């Protein structure tokens, strides 16, 4: 009978979404974690989740509905989004064929309509009891990650273990966000590594946020991590053709006290430092910004902010660490930031105070030449508007790389404290303690009083919204890896 | 094309190339060769309305997509038709305001009982279509040709939507030559003009027989396959009941390119029915064969994305259509394809 | 354990998969007068060129290697092709999951490198025991037929009892070739037709080769035996390009630069009486290289001729009214035969040479109620849409819509020449000559018939660099 069938559907549905959720919660309780569906509900707007492949099962013959991952689409702050969420309780969250096809369906759909994918990972690794088939589906997923790269924003949340095959797809996405205390990432696990190391010393959150650079953010708990991803999506377009969101703004038409502060933020002694974040917050709407890689390579700041309501990326040397010199980690952090923003048509605002590169045998032997040049590449390849604001030191190759006019910048303005030179008090072995030689030759466009920075950046940004640049014809470049 | 008078000989070539031919009752007729010639060569006496009157073209030949009761009827139908369409293949279609309600309604709940308990009892697929479309309204294409399939233009949340739905009232909803060609050219037109296709599937397959085979249901019935697999507009498919064999494949399945496929609990997806038992074991082994009389195996493999309660159809269809307005699919590089003729 | 043991184990599996299973297949197929899948591939491909893929593919949960199909690539007369061949002896040739994955792989490969696909079919379609999954896989094969339509040539050899998906996929390919006595096509078999509809028919009458070659139009050719059909396919491929971008083969030719006796014979080929007929094939053979051509649909709609030939070594498509059946008038079948042939040739950049002797359309309630308007207009669209070079030689009757349709200048023809016996008018009730049309420029030349071959060849050479602009559209909406 038709009604019996409809009741059988209600029974299968409660088995799949409420009974399995009770089971999943009891087991994620033993580790201090939320469930797959709880995370999905924290992430998406209430009532917007449309779940796909609810009644999928693997084919072998314990075959639970969904095969261990919840997939579907929803919205975040009104805009469409796709999501998959691993269920660590079934099969340790490992990837089988049905599992793999669910994530592949969710991914092909987002490629199809042009919307972001957020993957919520909490996965043992790979289902050995499905043999090579498990690996095939990891590879098919990664392949989709690669063809989506620079097409749709991709964000990975690491909310549990992540080992072996589970670490590749997050590595291919644009941002990886981990959670304190509950999450790990490692190619090889601690047991095999046989060495005497724990999971959190091998690959805990601090390791990836501060040493390897694999993690762009670590949330204090799951709610913080998810809240961070929601804020991030709020700066980004849905895909590489449509525009980023534009918000309203309460910006002042004239000079404020926060503007005038910039006149006194550079100290009189050249040894003394300042917080570059004091310049950044002066310029951005509401003094706010979302920092990327905040605990990695603190000598450079990479952040997303807004100016007159429009998205802007900020790349700034930070004199409060290593004097704001460039090294391997600051180069690779900033490079990939800039190449992502350029992929997604977000203009790049650079604040430059760079005295050179960090010297040492480790920098050289670890490969500063081909890893430092990635930042040169990124700037030179980008076609998005670039405004550069030179606050203080401007020496040599660091000056060249950090948004100079000759690497592509559309507008370079210099504070009077700017020293643009081949070198400092090292050449003899107020001649070069100013920007006026560079300005004389046209290498900087404007020499402004610091208080004018916000107003001149906003003007220039507006002047460049209709910018267009032809890019080389080629499959792809050959950036140094 | 409005055919509002005689239309013979050279006068019939342009209308046959246009996308819609609308005739007027009593005053119009179409043929290539006129009844005077059908006498001198065939020795048969036929009137003009016998040879190519509006009823012939609306019910037998298919040349006419609609016959107006009078001239004002025909023109009104064309006006309403244009009001669903874009001006060309680049600009968007009109969007109208809508009184669609967030909330399950009494019309929505009727779908829970629309499917009969007995396999030997059918339903009127129009009862489904009207529950999903804004104001329960739709302009029907070819309403008197191949009535075992319904092709129609309606709106969901103000947006033009094309509807292809097997109709079990007539000829068991089967797919035959006429139903295939009627639906096939509709889909291709809508795909050309960027109109998404909502399909309601309840099919036993293609119609077999000497009559169907000798006129070419293989090359003529498969035209609907080509049409769906070539199409790049969004496609949502609601499977109400039977879904066997080539029927299930052709009616907007996921593998033929559908973007979202939801099934009611009465959907029955399989290669055959009581015909299998016998290419297979040359009656317990028959009711064992309702591992198939449900959608759950297809759901197991991901071949349908959702098993929904019928009363939820409108609301899920609407969200699905909204989720696909930014769709973009790539096409083969070719001068043109080579669809079967 | 030893490396040499693993190699020997491989040799044993290879013997298992290709040698012993072949003797099983030859056993059963020979008893029904058929060859095996691997035998057929060996006849089709150049010797030694076959590279088999997916040899050791097996169903998952007897699971013979290959799951019922042999797939791979090879060359035919030196140019690359892909191929699959059903093994009817394994579960009736039905498509399971592994079977299907093999066919989709060689189809993706052909689309990848741009070469023809030849499918050899001897199957009962989708595998019932695998449920929706076998429908899924046949659907994915068909999807690749559609996305290949007009991209790579696709040819279907039908060499056994074919039903369901095994008749549906070949109907999307460009050509379907059947074999006498051993092959059938129908959406479902006679036993099911009876048990379900109460119709009692044999296989031969429901979908034998003759039915599809003469009545339905599903089959473009019926070979006398398997070897004849495979040879017809190899000859077909010899006229066609590998895909829609690379050029078609050019051959050496011994054409004569001056008038010959075969040329002069055309001056007397048209009878004095308008009541008497002639064999258009005599005109065609006089113009084509070596008087040779491969005829498409030879036994279907015989009032029109579709054929592939060559002029000065280049492939040429021939569409010609045939007076020796129904006086060469157009009907539904002749329109759909010639329409799809033209659209195929235009898809693959083969120029169309048209020989016109058309008195009008076949009248009747039948023609009209079966939709001559909607179906005959397919030939009009096919001609007007084509951008390939078009040369039309009008030999005699040229009335009304028939004239318009058969490659006239107004539908797009690049060069139109008329014989003195051409009667170009709106009907026949002098005006029974071509000079009014010539006076308006609707025909470009009036030639003596002996000069046809000389003038067709020059025109073809003159149009090789032709380039024509196309509508910006996803696709058209041709009447179906
Ligand atoms: C591209 C277009 C999209 C495509 C969409 C689709 O695919 S939808 C396609 C929908 N359906 C189909 O294609 C199936 C249509 N085929 C059939 O109905 C039937 O197979 C038939 C009409 C050919 C009848 O075949 P027979 O029963 O006469 O079998 P036959 O005597 O020829 O030899 C068959 C031997 O193999 C078995 N066999 C035959 N066909 C089989 C099949 N389709 N699935 C499983 N097993 C089959 C038989 O059980 C028998 O084995 P044993 O006796 O040893 O057990």
Author numbering:
A (entry chain E): 16 to 76, 81 to 212, 217 to 452, 481 to 532
B (entry chain F): 175 to 456, 474 to 532
C (entry chain B): 15 to 75, 81 to 448, 482 to 532
Task: Reproduce the article's own wording on this structure.
Similar to other bacterial YCC β-subunits, MccB has 3–2 symmetry and is composed of three individual dimers that form a ring-like hexamer. Each monomer can be divided into two domains harbouring two copies of the crotonase fold that pack together in an antiparallel manner to form a dimer. Taken together, these results establish the existence of a unique YCC-dependent pathway for unusual polyketide extender unit biosynthesis.
These co-crystal structures were obtained via incubation of MccB with 5 or 10 mM hexanoyl-CoA before crystallization. The hexanoyl-CoA bound structures reveal that some of the substrate-binding features of MccB are similar to those employed by other YCC β-subunits. The residues that interact with hexanoyl-CoA are localized in three regions at the MccB dimer interface. The first region is located at the entrance of the substrate binding pocket, which is characterized by a network of hydrogen bonds between the adenosine moiety of hexanoyl-CoA and the protein. In addition, the sulfur atom of the thioester is hydrogen bonded to the backbone N-H of Gly420. The third region is the binding pocket for the aliphatic portion of the substrate, which is formed primarily by the hydrophobic side chains of Ile396, Phe399 and Ala423 in Monomer F, and Leu191, Tyr157 and Tyr187 in monomer B.
